[PDB]
């Protein structure tokens, strides 16, 4: 990926990266919102 | 608060001042428009809506879109005036620093959000593919796998069109923005650090090595309470008349063969006396007046179309023989013929007795051959008639209405040519045509007592019941109750549960009372065990409560106590679950953890790192 | 916060102290007394003689309650004109007027009230707070017919449209309602009140205030409508949040922790409510239903036996080979209903009419196969019976049985299993007061009929016709042959598996929309569990495939799972045989829902938008039919 | 708010670009680092040698989440009487303590967090957060069976009444619980604490303080019960909103616009999970279903044939007039399983017993109906076979075949039909290792058996026998015959359609409780369409009816829909054959639903109150039985 | 004071002018304490 | 803050370090008065 002579990014295919799927870190973004209109007034 | 801002005109302060208050437009802070008062809840929700967008900020600013954040809280306006919905209610409500907004600016905001979410309609899919192609979440504990291996896998399975192939780093950082289990080194300093943002949101979604996670506890008891509420436990266990438009439910159709039935059990049939030695032949016209000749005889059967709760009938003849020495079913016709008369069908021997008659629809038959050698078989017929008491427009209370299905032809059939008194020997389907009437044992009714349906039915009467009968509605609502229990209850064979002890109490005071017959004392343990078995029997089959001669469910008091104790049993829960529930759930979770670890090990060995 | 206002008496205490706290009653805070409640709405009498003069405990009102009980007040105020036309509730309750803001120890128990010292907590008595909700709910009773009349004025002709804008002149639409609304409508009575209420709740309708010839918007719900309104690019935010939650709801029900388990699981945990099933013992292949015992045939043995019932009257019947019975043991109590209706059974000297048939239960050590004389039956009883009525059928000259309901329910605990060497069987055949010539009748039994078989136990399940306390979900995948399923029991683990894992299929289809032979985020876990199932070194001829091929296999396989979820259990299933296939897919459905972001499919949304305009086109076509028949001056 | 606390790098207030910020870290705010945390509840150890000294990221909690997590603690406090006996968690965690309020720029990206400064933002570290959620749900494990016991004490005898109030002396009921509580119940070891804990959560239970003989309410949930009680005129409040949204969940799931859409709609967005369907093959009129290609009746042509299976293992079978084969193309990959159990086939010279049958797949260019010889079959193979056993049936002197499950699943993705003229047909018939005589095998096929079908794909929608990826769901209204449906393929749109429409049907019934002819808010949608449509110049004589008629005529049609959904796709329905009315029917539902404001039917109120009091009448009846046979001293 | 049958009155259904009154409120007893 | 499967640890069971926690105490009724 490195498009520059000097790299100061995050080597995705580099070493030192960590992959530890844990229960405490169960992924989610924004499944649903309480957009009920009675509660929205 | 909530509503619309208000502005005063007159010098009145008293509540219920007649013309005190008038609406406040935008000008009272070109195009002057009214204003609305936002609430705290809506503000929280809409701000959370924005926070979805910045989950993908990197890919966005790479894609040169939406370079400045929406910032909902900014678009607001702050005033402290009268607020409410009705003037005569806002007049006694005056808040401080309420948030207000024009409808158009609010629309512009939500439209920006909506169109923004439109663009990422594919990038989200690609990220979902990335997180789902291999397990990036585990139920219990924690698993792990080297990053070179997993990355070498992704560059081996993601489709060539996937955006990750052309926009890697932003995809990676977005992944880490919601998955604490993936981290990226910071070669600037050389540090590894959680970057996931939904930290607290995932805590409730986690186990605790002794208990199940919170979310399924809360949600499962949610569904339990929802079912028991929607079942209307007051009505189902009532003790007085209830109008059918309340009691009734969407019903399911029924299957029948009229010839197979018992005439006395089925209250909705009349029959012409067997071996009466009377064979008369009568003629009826269609809706276009064409006269068809039909023959009747003893052994005929009909249906008493009065007191039916308007129905729809479709007949099916497939598989039946109806072959005859000089009367081949092939090429013939059958129809639904209505008979309207004052005379009971048991008293019909002549022609003019029949009163008014009509045929409503007819078909042609066909004859093929079957498994048995030299035997002919009729095709599938779907001849139907949907009944409504409005059309025939009953006037005289002594007027009677009978429906029959038999052969019809345009030539006078010799009676000796054929011996079937009808063709009701055929699988019949009967589907309710209305949803606001309810019957009982073939009798129409208007005011049922949901209690006294307990134990009032024999099994053959249950199979001979009409599709729109109160018994079936009772079954279905108690069925919802049965699930509610099953979601709640987990007590195994021969074990007391908070959903069986009402039966125990009803029995325990029943044993101590004074009535008909010898007394049979039992210790309390037997009573509890019995109640458990009976409740599990109800769970096995809802219809068994109404059954005559039931072991326990034959008692109305047992049923009432069960139904009512259900409500308290659910409502008094406190984020709790059963014991075997938790133990098995945790054990299974650990098993799945082992499975995931083994699989990711297969990956690590099948995709080496330098 | 919550809990109860706690007062301190310890007087030198900080935390966990033995006797620091006491309940705080309405004498401590006289403002929370029922003589000092503001009598707006007059719900408490002004006569001196009628007040209890007693004290009641006080309780704490939270953020959510005030923000909600106040929200209820608008339901009245949306219909405020009809109220004063009705002269009820001259003054709005204004809930925040019946509270008292205090600062003291607060909490459900004294232990955690003891460090929870807040400020300006709202406080109320059971009676004063009870009086409040009575005030509200009375008005709902008063508005009962108004609400029905209001709605039918709205749901008569289309007034909301999913997309864009339609139009209609006022004099047409007011004329339209004029003739078609019910005579007893409250609109006829008080028509201008019906006018004002719409504009409060519907922005489209607007009333020109005659004073200035002006017109503006009036709807109080402006913010909410936007959350329910489409943009021309995508579906509304409202249900995009809702159509996704139900998936997370359905998955929560299935409990993928269980259906992905690789360990024994107790039956009550795994069990689900069962459904009735149907069988025919006579045609049921003996080797497939491992619960049917059958005396062999062609031995020439033939005899009769006599067995009483609970009433003590004796009975006479026959026995011979070929006879099928059910092993009542280890069948997790069932209910048996057997309708002879539809069969012939006619014999050259024995018609079935008039006679009776019934259920027989047997008990012995000697297995049912060796039975060849009369003294090998041990214990016996006749538990039910019914008569036969034969009418005649289409099939010429041949009579048929009418509907029957021979019914019985096996219960172990009553039958009181004690001996490991026992054996219990159920038999149904012709029974009679007088004995029967063994050759006047020939049928080995009367099982040539239709039986219905419903479970009675709940938390106890069988697998392959045998009951077991523990069960492993994985040991079911791809082992029940199509035959073995049909010959199985109702209360079977497979059937218990088909339904419970079916709810996944509902969840997958409402979330994903993949067409034929293209991937999906739920098709992909399978797509991964293959490449590594393939790359390793093993038995057979290893078959290599591009990911473009590996993809489509799952993409089809996921479609097959939806249509018939019971395909996974089929032995030698095409793709879904592997447990790892099932595990990867089943686990991932949870993840694919947690990570959605208010997103619709690329295919889906356009169709909804395309649909929405057509309905808009339909409405305006309708709205002109009002114009052409109800013109305006 | 929400997000992550961002810090300014470099100088104070020098923030000008998104690249001039940085995520905070517990180093920056050391108060939120675990050597400082208030160890109340004793979670973190006290060894100075077991502590990380490693910093962790900081996260922001949301104001609507603290209210939720505080109440999580409230669950325990309903049991603290038992806890301190159990000697667990002596100090309630009081979540607020773990929080720390710092003010900074907060967001979920450095860009937007730049523009978003805030004051007094609570913060937490993920490790500390896990400790608190643990601290609660850990203790729940302890309460596992104390919870079960007391929930029994609540429900063994009626302690909640639907209406009014009921009474009985304590000293009586206690003797009963003493008489019935399981001997292993914790109550029998801890009566006093169990007594207190109940009185916490039940207003009626009221113990007496012996020190000065006072009895008072101890309910801490006096506000929750407020909205759970009924009034004297209407049902309770808590449920109507529960009841009213629950209909609104069915409608959105049913997606009203799609099922009332005039534009073309694709398959995978419309297709929904299917249902197995059952047919009989000989009995079907050949001119009804297109998927049945049958060689002309009474052909009387004899032609034997050799075929080879998937291993080439030869099988032999004959073809004759009346043989019927399935037109395998356009079948939307499907699963056929055939069930032959019951039928005889036993001819006079050729017994079924000990023979094999199987599916045969035919592939040729020549149309199948024109077949006369072996050069017209093209390519044909067997795909599965079974074995048949015989029994004896109700009709004496003829045997009967046992039950069979011949199966085969169809998928076009593997055959790869590449030329349209290439034609795919499937037959089921007898197969044997030896050629069979035509004079004996007079059966044209073996299609005289019940046959089951399940779709193996949820993206293919069939209409009128054929399959097309485009559907117009407006046209399916009233466009089928009863004959069409039973002949319809299992994945027919109208089958899927009524399933989508079923929820709409259900959602109505939850709302409406009207009787004959009774105009409802969900009836008048049709009434209007009848109003115009009567008046317009349609085909036929114009006939006029008054408004009351149009009400009831719509009223019958309404319920006629609710009673049964198949009437929307029925040729010549009373009204429903109209495409137009179905359109205006759905769009009525939403406005009806969204404009309800906390009320139910007038009939429902009068029924519920009279019904509910009967329980209160009944419950007292039960209760006074106890005081008699358990007398108060 | 308003002319229901007079001209000048605006009737114009917009999606953005969607209609609601008070469908439901969230009264879960757990969340009311 | 310790590495279970790391190095540096030592496993040297000895006579002088033979495990025991609390088998039994001397709680005679006569002894306790
Ligand atoms: C869009 C709904 C508009 C409804 C306006 C109020 C109803 C009109 C009143 C009907 C009676 C008119 C009497 C005249 O005179
Ligand atoms: C309404 C139930 C309140 C709590 C009842 C507690 C029941 C205790 C059963 C008897 C305990 C005996 C202990 C001594 O002896
Ligand atoms: C660096 O040397 C540029 C080329 C390597 C970039 C990594 C491979 C490209 C795709 C990102 C990760 C691979 C899986 C998508």
Numbering used by the authors:
A (entry chain A): 2 to 42
B (entry chain a): 43 to 71, 95 to 675
C (entry chain c), D (entry chain b): 43 to 675
E (entry chain C), F (entry chain D): 10 to 42
Quote from the publication.
Mammalian reovirus (MRV) is the prototypical member of genus Orthoreovirus of family Reoviridae. Here, we report the 3.3 Å-resolution asymmetric reconstruction of transcribing MRV and in situ atomic models of its capsid proteins, the asymmetrically attached RNA-dependent RNA polymerase (RdRp) λ3, and RdRp-bound nucleoside triphosphatase μ2 with a unique RNA-binding domain. All viruses in the Reoviridae are capable of transcribing RNA inside intact capsids (endogenous transcription) without the need of host factors, an attracting characteristic that allows viral RNA transcription of these viruses to be studied in vitro in cell-free environment. The ISVP transcribes its ten genomic segments, adds a methylated guanosine cap to the 5′ end of each mRNA transcript, and releases the capped mRNA from the turrets at the capsid vertices.
Each asymmetric unit is composed of three and one third μ1 trimers—Q, R, S, and 1/3T trimers—totaling ten μ1 monomers. Our asymmetric reconstruction reveals two types among the ten N-myristoyl fragments in each asymmetric unit: nine are at the interface between two μ1 trimers, and one is at the interface between μ1 and λ2. The bond is formed via complementarity between Loop 51–61 of one μ1 trimer and Loop 72–96 of its neighboring μ1 trimer. Five λ2 subunits form a pentameric turret with an axial channel. When TECs of ISVP are in the transcription initiation state, most of the N-myristoyl fragments of membrane penetration protein µ1 remain hidden inside the hydrophobic pockets. This observation suggests that the trigger for RNA transcription is not the attachment of µ1 to the cell membrane, but rather the removal of protection protein σ3 from the capsid surface.
